Subunit: 152 residues, 12 copies
């Protein structure tokens, strides 16, 4: 209604092995890169007055240090921790320590894979979780974050 | 679109979701399952998606609706609510008719009691959305369109 | 003229069989005899008791939905649905009417799957193994909570 | 011999047999099975009745209605094997002997399917022999009731 | 009717009732409860005796002393429910029927509290109904002993 | 003149004791009576049945090895080796002859270690608790699979 | 004139009840009869036997403390404290006197919580299910270890 | 008194006793033990026979051959305690009472060794008392059979 | 201090700690529980902390001492020894009187048998010290002073 | 008694997220930084002829490499591994490999938090463990190390 | 070598390995246990290793061969096949004669069913090789020579 | 037979703490370094027309990034993940993502140590596993890789 939203500052964090997307047998498994996904997500965010920053890393410390740098500069996090979902208590405690709401995203439906993959050190503290929807899960998390911060 | 083929989508809601918006609206929120399915119907009709909906406290009525969907429906969105944790019969219904589905939960089950972590559906769903509220239905609808139209 | 308590008694599956197989071997008492006796005891205390027994999970859930802002208290013997119905747990949490859980038999003396309840942890309390007087104890207990004696 | 009264109960999803990819998974319906089983029973002075249902309550209430009408039950509870304590308590409460049948080998599928709320109180269990499991259960019931 | 001899046993920490933040948690003592229960018993020709103790041995030796003096036991073993096999073996050894009572709903507290070394051999169990649980157990004992 | 089926029946330990302890208390029937009856029923269907019972794990394994390209189907009551012999599981997987598993008693009603089988998951199916007719049902079932009726 | 062995026999809770409920139904024998018999058998072997039975956990612990450098060997039937007393385990480890654990009944045939002992793993050994002769076997065994025959 | 017929069965690896580092672990053989036990039995009009074997089948078939020849069995099944359901079913099937003996304290070794397929159906179990465990089991069998 | 308020501190020791220093002093050490409580009393008296102590092999004597501490004691230091693993009644005593405590163990329980990893007290203690020997009591005392004097 | 102690070389290692101390709602949760704690610990150590070195890190490799560099240069370690307690077998094997005694310290009482936090890949090999005492747990570990190395 | 001392090595193979190369050679491979032991004998004889071999479906024949190895054999290579998961008696045979061994499996058990992850032998073996095929025997032989000749 | 093998490109990866080999009480536990082992393995490989590259690291990201760089440049991996066997799902998913066959090697017999060490996030996907054979396990993995790639 008759009022203007301030700019959301949103940080997207991607865990290990997601830099491989689009590279192995592109003709067999798909040609789309993490870069094509972040670029399309950045454009979708900027239409809605969301300023999107992104880090992908194989290095657990680079995600943790980015979350610590987020304190008082970021309103929301979207994170696909990939394999760190199952193993990083450090990341859990980084997100609890800076107290920024987040949504957890997985490309694949982890509930269909090995049974170790069913357990997350993040899901219980996340505002919510999206699994198995491919790249569009990032766009759903973005739509969800805007809704919760603008109460719309 | 007098562009695309009509998708036939079935939305199924499990027990107790009929209570949404009823108790202490001023404390827990005002929105009804009706309001959610009306808004989702409007979103689907703009994309040439024909939405039909059943909520029920009766296990049997969800299973028989899944049976009746065979060769009529392209995709299912289901919030089974408590039946996620208990209904092998709903799992066997979805496997027997072999229509792809997405499982939706309004609340974040991973933050509630630990029995709620277990689903007889998650492992066979094309994917799962938890904790995003009513918009989880609209994400599942956008996902189904994406998969069926390759877009 | 304390206020009239509106109390709902819910019985789960198979309790309709009470008293009916080898009555002279296992006891004579029907669910009917129990609910009649309980209704009379309630009416002496200005408690309006209504009752549904069912083998249909949906009928217990729908009755709990319909109880919202009509009922002060529930006494429930869910029988076998104690062990399996998350949906009934979510119905009682969703309408937020206090209840007590009753079992005629001592479940802790029977097969070990019977030890787990999807209700015991949200009940105001639990009575097991005292037979039909368990309903009468739940009734006395509900009057106590509601009349703050 | 005395006419045996036999009740066959079939649980959820079994109405789907024959219907999806008939050319790939079999063309045979629950109907074809129960017709053949009724004929086999009538040759042995066994009066067979049947109920299939997706509704737990219809199976429970049929077991209640069976008390002092039925000598034996054959039941394929399908998914309810794994979840319905209420059916277990219905069969215990009416105290009719029964046999449990499954068309598929459940031990070869997901490991939740290994647990039954019925197997321990059944006279017997037949898994994985397809529709002939029903006919085995019928021959077994006749044998126990006619001591043969 | 014959005079019933009833023994009430209360386990550790129950002497604390009424004492900490009386205005916040209730002002009612174990004393108030046992006085009221003795009066209720005497109206029904039930001779009630009581022992509360923080000492496991005093409860065990009281159960031994009960043999051929007592018709029924009501016991709130408090924390000993979860830990005392010795009390289980004392009640089995004297073979007096008993009912187990807890003031609070143990199923709503930490999950170690869900296990009892007594629940399976008790005639019955009452949890979470506060002090009236004692009076229910008394009415139940009278009913079984006087067949009413 | 359907083709002659070559069927091997294998019995595990302790089944040699059948009918022998308190015959007038537990039943009269020996393993011998069962195998004779089964052989006759097989011969009516142009099924050539051969049988080995043994308390020796090795003799069951070596008989399954020797069955390779001589036998169309196995009926096996492994008795106590159901719970403990991985080696028999690997023998039936190694020769890749289909089998059905039979138990005279309902194992699911007995001690809870008896619920687990190193065979049930690779069997074409399983029969429990119907006594000696279980062998005759397995035979009828094998003819059905092999003659595609 | 081998050396005099000082042997302490410790009995746990509820063993005072032996022989006393339905003596003509369950057996006549008291703990007293057992300890008298055992004392006589010990005195024939120049074994000085002392005995404490108790329902008090503390009295068994304090007796084990007092045994330090007075006692060569302990025979203990901890009865129900086998399953629950870490403190008794730590008392026997703290004084480092060898013991044997005795149970009259076969605990492995009873409820499955009775299978676990906080003592069996540090005992020199364990006797179950042979009734009162188990004490006499423990005594013969302790003489054997101490007299190296 | 009547002559008792007693069978002693010893499981795998027990033929090794006395043989490796005799000066370090003991010089005593299974032979020395069974000779001493035969002498002790003959003084009490107990006719003792023995079989030790590394072969599961020889123990099972000896238990079958014992039916209506033997009053009592003493068995040290050694490793077969933990693995042979077949031996459990052989002793149940012939219904001869037995006692289980182990030379070592199994509760002090690896935790798989805590489980037995025999302990629950044995008359009794003796662990960790070395060769005298055999002589205790013999005295126990005589006591039960001669009511003494 | 004719500076600070006196803290009233209760030190409770569980079963078998009376044996300290008794068996093979030349092998396992010479120090008695007496020597430890004397040194800890001297340390507390310099800080205007009144220390009272009970060791016992009797469960009941620890529980009744906790009861008697209500409205007399500001803090408890407790080495429950074996009763850590077994006494729900001691847990319910400390929760009923609601005096803050610190749990101390002389040995490192995490390096002994695995049953010793489990405590009916650790989750309610203000904190836990294991494996530091007798000085663990003096650390618990320094911690209690820190918490109660805000220093 | 009538003899002088050599200088102890003591290394304090702090794991992930402990750099956040003092930063979030200081007015609500406390204003004290890891730096104020290490500074006060350094002063307390230097009074007793203990030379204290310190590394805090979000990066698992920096703790491991510091433990390897400690070999033959450090007499004792005090470590608060924070979330790495629950997940780093690498750190366990670094401390076993250099064979320097250590004490494990947690600020919070982990036994009161989620149940995953009850399990440590370190506690069983530690000389001892201190949980829930706040910053003073470091000073207790230091007093304990001096006692064990000087047999006082 | 008229250089080194002869090593006496016993190779033991468990049940069902006699089937190697028999069923669908054109699908699953042509190699027999015979071919493997002949090639391994040739490899051992070039290194002054005397190889003797027993395969058996009989548990007892492996145990009695281990008994007979005492003071005759320097090392054992054993592929127990299914008996890895079930034979406490084979474990107790190897511990009683106290000859060092290496456990070999042709297939990668960690990739098959989860009961196959558990061994009553692995924890006492000097080491374990899985999943490398027939060459696993030749690696175990090279390892035994390395350990016994310090090379 | 009458035909020439192309050059195998083989990558050896060593996890944390393996740089410590040969350094602690060499007189008690052995004097051999990871370097002496890689040097002898390189020589054995080069005799058989195998070009061997090696990275050892305490840093999980350096192993992951090396596996990603291996894609389309390496035919086979030999990896001793050391303690990362028990904890790194990231490494599992790096090896699945580049789809290069590997063999897992441990110096020690992990089945004889603590029971946590019995579980690997790698063993199930490995072509095979070698434990407890010391340094020669690397040479066995190398002989095994040549055999599988040359069908010899």
């Amino acid at each position: 209604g008759s009022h203007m939203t301030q700019q959301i500052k949103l940080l997207v964090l991607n865990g290990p092995n997601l830099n491989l997307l689009g590279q192995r047998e592109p003709e067999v498994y798909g040609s789309k890169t993490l870069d094509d996904i972040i670029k399309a997500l950045t454009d979708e965010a900027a239409l809605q007055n969301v300023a999107l920053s992104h880090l992908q890393s194989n290095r657990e410390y680079e995600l943790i240090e980015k979350i610590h740098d987020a304190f008082e500069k970021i309103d929301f996090i979207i994170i696909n921790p990939a394999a760190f979902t199952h193993t990083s208590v450090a990341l859990r405690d980084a997100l609890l320590g800076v107290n920024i709401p987040f949504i957890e995203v997985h490309l694949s439906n982890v509930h269909a894979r090995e049974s170790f993959r069913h357990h997350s050190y993040l899901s219980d503290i996340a505002q919510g979780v999206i699994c198995g929807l491919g790249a569009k899960g990032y766009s759903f998390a973005l739509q969800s974050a805007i809704g919760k911060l603008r109460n719309i």
